Design a protein around this ligand. Structure first.
Ligand SMILES: CC(C)CCC[C@@H](C)[C@H]1CC[C@H]2[C@@H]3CC=C4C[C@@H](OC(=O)CCC(=O)O)CC[C@]4(C)[C@H]3CC[C@]12C
Ligand SMILES: CC(C)CCC[C@@H](C)[C@H]1CC[C@H]2[C@@H]3CC=C4C[C@@H](OC(=O)CCC(=O)O)CC[C@]4(C)[C@H]3CC[C@]12C
Ligand SMILES: CC(C)CCC[C@@H](C)[C@H]1CC[C@H]2[C@@H]3CC=C4C[C@@H](OC(=O)CCC(=O)O)CC[C@]4(C)[C@H]3CC[C@]12C
Ligand SMILES: CC(C)CCC[C@@H](C)[C@H]1CC[C@H]2[C@@H]3CC=C4C[C@@H](OC(=O)CCC(=O)O)CC[C@]4(C)[C@H]3CC[C@]12C
Ligand SMILES: CC(C)CCC[C@@H](C)[C@H]1CC[C@H]2[C@@H]3CC=C4C[C@@H](OC(=O)CCC(=O)O)CC[C@]4(C)[C@H]3CC[C@]12C
Ligand SMILES: FC(F)(F)c1ccccc1-c1cc(C(F)(F)F)c2[nH]c(C3=NOC4(CCCCC4)C3)nc2c1
Ligand SMILES: FC(F)(F)c1ccccc1-c1cc(C(F)(F)F)c2[nH]c(C3=NOC4(CCCCC4)C3)nc2c1
Ligand SMILES: CCCCCCCCCP(=O)(C(C)C)C(C)C
Ligand SMILES: CC(=O)N[C@@H]1[C@@H](O)[C@H](O)[C@@H](CO)O[C@H]1O
Ligand SMILES: CC(=O)N[C@@H]1[C@@H](O)[C@H](O)[C@@H](CO)O[C@H]1O
Lengths: 201, 155, 103
């Protein structure tokens, strides 16, 4: 109902006024100074408080996390394709640190919930990705051998596929792509029938 | 020649104005107007396509070749070939060990793709049983399912 | 087709002076691109030469312009995106739109 949606939108934008356009707030996110300016309108209510409100909003936190995840994917790809060696270099250690941060957050989410946590597909995929990353690390530290390194690299590539596919899940709140992403679940039986006939033939 | 290229791009821009000027025909006009309403479906299609291309290209490049060190060929192998896969071309002739070699360079001197990693014996080191299913799934998702979904949304 | 063919022909080759090959390069190849064929093997510098004539004596497409060194002069970073966009618009979007309108 519209009332609950408006309440959720107000919570989502936090202090920032919902009347503000998204591109303005994104631009102010990318360049800090403009938040001190009047480009972004704060409905609820000194620059210090302005910045605190701007950076306490879950909307901005989500956007920042998306940027961080994209940068993490870029670093992962660069390490995998261009700077993979017998002994890990600095970028790979940074990647390990970022994955450790993701793992600690995942453990927090584990503890908050119970075994119902693993009843969702995406949580299972996250756990699988972390486990495969750990397995790749284990394989890759046998630098003397020339086959364990490549096994770890393949593990990392599959894990990269799994990591990349999470973007679809995280972009289900866009209000333009979300409904269409949701609608894909309803179309699986047609695919099953198609594959059945195709396989028989 | 720089001026000639500028003129060619300007010619593209000039030619595209015919669509705007022919929006008063009463037969083509409404259909031309209706194209504005269909951009979000295109955006969703491109979003899924780009995600899948990135994943597949990175995985394949990492599994076949190591340490390219060339940006142009990195982007050619990661982005261009999966993109062409949408039009019916199998993404890689290198996905199968049979169709390999004689089109590679061990050193980046030549304008050829980097050669696949080799084991202690001089034979390719990647496993076909991983690559082939990968390419099969990618082609199935891109060529067939996504295009039909776009058709349905347009309808 | 008109836009893409004129742009590509101007960017690759200069002063054809032959009408038949002008229309073959400008109209025929983009038209075939609708049926799944990539418009040009010449859009990429790797797949070029040995199928060209510097003079119009032979029944071959005119050779691409060359720089002070004997290497092709066009930029791939312009041609390849052009062909990508053209194929995307023609092969996929337009045909699906036609299907929808027919329905
Ligand atoms: C660090 C570098 C390498 C990344 C630059 C690439 C950009 C194209 C990416 C980075 C940050 C991304 C943005 C971060 C947050 C958002 C908001 C998002 O819109 C919403 O989620 C609205 C949610 C709602 O309406 O409730 C659309 C994508 C956008 C602009 C993301 C789209 C693409 C951006 C601009
Ligand atoms: C280039 C390779 C080797 C490294 C992988 C980088 C990717 C993480 C980059 C490349 C292309 C980018 C994407 C191109 C298109 C989109 C959709 C876009 O979605 C929206 O902005 C929705 C906005 C709205 O709904 O209004 C978010 C960014 C994303 C995934 C871009 C951000 C990140 C991507 C996947
Ligand atoms: C041939 C190349 C090298 C030079 C470029 C010439 C173009 C400007 C010519 C070639 C094909 C012609 C087009 C073929 C089809 C049409 C649609 C036509 O639209 C209508 O007549 C609508 C009538 C109605 O709605 O009833 C107008 C002319 C146009 C653009 C023709 C006029 C001009 C075009 C684009
Ligand atoms: C569920 C849908 C989306 C995928 C169905 C497509 C099939 C055609 C795929 C699925 C599993 C694939 C098979 C999995 C494993 C192999 C062994 C492979 O043979 C080898 O290369 C072995 C190499 C060696 O022995 O060293 C040939 C392909 C095949 C039958 C793959 C070929 C294509 C298959 C049958
Ligand atoms: C937004 C949609 C409709 C287009 C997305 C399709 C992509 C596959 C296109 C868009 C930008 C293109 C890239 C822009 C520039 C280059 C460099 C080019 O390398 C060169 O030829 C450089 C030549 C030199 O160094 O002298 C190879 C293609 C690439 C990655 C192009 C290949 C195809 C790309 C990624
Ligand atoms: F129209 C469509 F969307 F196809 C589709 C239509 C109807 C029902 C399901 C789908 C669908 C949805 C998704 C999801 F939304 F879940 F992503 C799909 N994902 C994939 C693949 N995943 O990874 C691949 C690319 C990366 C390499 C491995 C293979 C392809 N195929 C999907 C089919
Ligand atoms: F069904 C369709 F129409 F595809 C379409 C369907 C749904 C949404 C948008 C479009 C659309 C519309 C137009 C426009 F109506 F605005 F023209 C397009 N124009 C182009 C290109 N412009 O120039 C190119 C040819 C010349 C060389 C450069 C590339 C292709 N692609 C479009 C896609
Ligand atoms: C195999 C999937 C890996 C998921 C690992 C958990 C990452 C969570 C993604 P995020 O929480 C952001 C903090 C990167 C998303 C909601 C923006
Ligand atoms: C340092 C270096 O690049 N050496 C290579 C050499 O191995 C190769 O034989 C030659 C031909 O490609 O090009 C150069
Ligand atoms: C005036 C003229 O046309 N000369 C050409 C000549 O350059 C070319 O070598 C020969 C073979 O193609 O055909 C003729």
């Amino acid at each position: 109902q519209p009332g609950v949606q408006n309440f959720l939108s107000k919570q989502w934008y936090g202090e920032i006024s919902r009347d503000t356009k998204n591109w303005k707030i994104i631009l102010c996110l990318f360049i800090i100074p403009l938040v001190g300016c009047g480009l972004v309108s704060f409905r609820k209510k000194k620059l210090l408080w302005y910045y605190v409100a701007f950076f306490t909003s879950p909307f901005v936190v989500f956007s920042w996390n998306v940027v961080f995840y994209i940068a993490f994917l870029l670093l992962f790809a660069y390490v995998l394709l261009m700077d993979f060696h017998s002994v890990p270099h600095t970028p790979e250690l940074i990647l390990y640190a970022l994955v450790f941060v993701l793992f600690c957050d995942e453990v927090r989410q584990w503890y908050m919930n119970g075994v119902n946590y693993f009843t969702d597909l995406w949580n299972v995929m996250d756990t699988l990705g972390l486990f495969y990353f750990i397995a790749g690390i284990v394989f890759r530290l046998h630098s003397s051998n020339k086959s364990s390194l490549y096994s770890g690299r393949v593990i990392f590539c599959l894990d990269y596929i799994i990591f990349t596919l999470r973007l679809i899940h995280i972009f289900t709140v866009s209000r333009n792509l979300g409904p269409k992403i949701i609608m894909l679940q309803r179309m699986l039986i047609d695919v099953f029938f198609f594959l059945f006939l195709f396989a028989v033939w | 020649y720089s001026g000639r290229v500028i003129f060619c791009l300007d010619y593209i821009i000039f030619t595209l104005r015919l669509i705007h000027i022919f929006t008063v025909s009463r037969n083509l006009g409404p259909k031309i107007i209706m194209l504005q309403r269909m951009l979000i479906d295109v955006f969703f299609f491109l979003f899924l396509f780009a995600v899948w291309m990135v994943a597949f290209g990175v995985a394949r490049q990492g599994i076949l070749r190591q340490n390219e060190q060339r940006w142009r060929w990195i982007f050619r192998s990661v982005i261009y070939e999966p993109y062409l896969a949408m039009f019916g071309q199998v993404p890689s002739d290198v996905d199968s060990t049979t169709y390999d070699f004689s089109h590679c360079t061990f050193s980046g001197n030549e304008s050829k793709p980097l050669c696949v990693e080799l084991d202690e014996h001089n034979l390719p080191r990647f496993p076909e049983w991983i690559t082939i299913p990968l390419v099969c799934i990618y082609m199935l998702s891109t060529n067939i399912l996504l295009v039909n979904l776009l058709v349905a949304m347009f309808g």
